[PDB]
Amino acid sequence: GSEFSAKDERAREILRGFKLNWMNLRDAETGKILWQGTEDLSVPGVEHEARVPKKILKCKAVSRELNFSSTEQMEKFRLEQKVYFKGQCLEEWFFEFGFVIPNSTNTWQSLIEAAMPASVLTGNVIIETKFFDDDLLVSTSRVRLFYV
Ligand SMILES: COC(=O)[C@@H](N)CSC/C=C(\C)CC/C=C(\C)CC/C=C(\C)CCC=C(C)C
């Protein structure tokens, strides 16, 4: 039993004012779109799914582009992602956007390098994402991946 702090309140404000507008993945060797979403995969407390083309597992590198809106100002917007296959953490990724202007829309591109078959991976891979503003944890969200 504790206070609902100033940090608890601001983390809640950032979450209620944040939306992921769209996202896509491009083959980094061709610049061509492999997968697009408009579903907000950022939303915590819902068990999200993504159905990506199995040919993605072939790519040496993919670029990921996010477009997001934030009513609240953020000093250092950043993501930590862990990739799980049946509970084993296979990858740990860090991406930094930086300062977010209040009531702004923003585009963010990152590069992911391909560090087992689609038959086995499909439905057994979870990406867990932690959304921070510096050291304030705003949300934790999870996406189960399928290769189709
Ligand atoms: C085994 O699968 C692989 O990852 C290999 N193909 C190597 S790499 C390719 C990239 C992929 C498939 C991972 C893309 C990531 C996804 C679908 C998760 C997107 C989630 C977010 C960007 C988090 C959204 C949350 C916010 C903004 C708070």
Author numbering: -2 to 112, 118 to 150
Question: What does the study report here?
Answer:
RAS is a major anticancer drug target which requires membrane localization to activate downstream signal transduction. Phosphodiesterase 6δ (PDE6D) has a beta-sandwich immunoglobulin fold which contains a hydrophobic pocket capable of binding to the farnesyl group. PDE6D binds to and sequesters the lipid of cytoplasmic RAS and has been proposed to deliver GTPase to recycling endosomes, which is followed by release mediated by the small G-protein Arf-like 2 (ARL2), allowing RAS to be trafficked back to the plasma membrane. The resultant lipid modification increases the affinity of RAS proteins toward membranes, where it is required for signal transduction. Here, we present a novel strategy for targeting RAS by stabilizing its interaction with the prenyl-binding protein PDE6D and disrupting its localization.
The only conserved feature is the modified C-terminal cysteine residue. Indeed, the affinities of 13-residue C-terminal peptides of WT KRAS and HRAS for PDE6D (1.3 and 2.7 μM, respectively) are comparable to those reported for full-length KRAS (1–2 μM)29 and RheB (∼0.5 μM). These affinities are also similar to those of a carboxymethylated geranylgeranylated cysteine residue (2.7 μM) and a carboxymethylated farnesylated cysteine residue (0.9 μM), suggesting that most residues preceding the lipidated cysteine do not affect binding to PDE6D. Interestingly, in addition to N/H/KRAS, more 4 farnesylated proteins, 10 geranylgeranylated, and 6-double geranylgeranylated binding partners were identified.
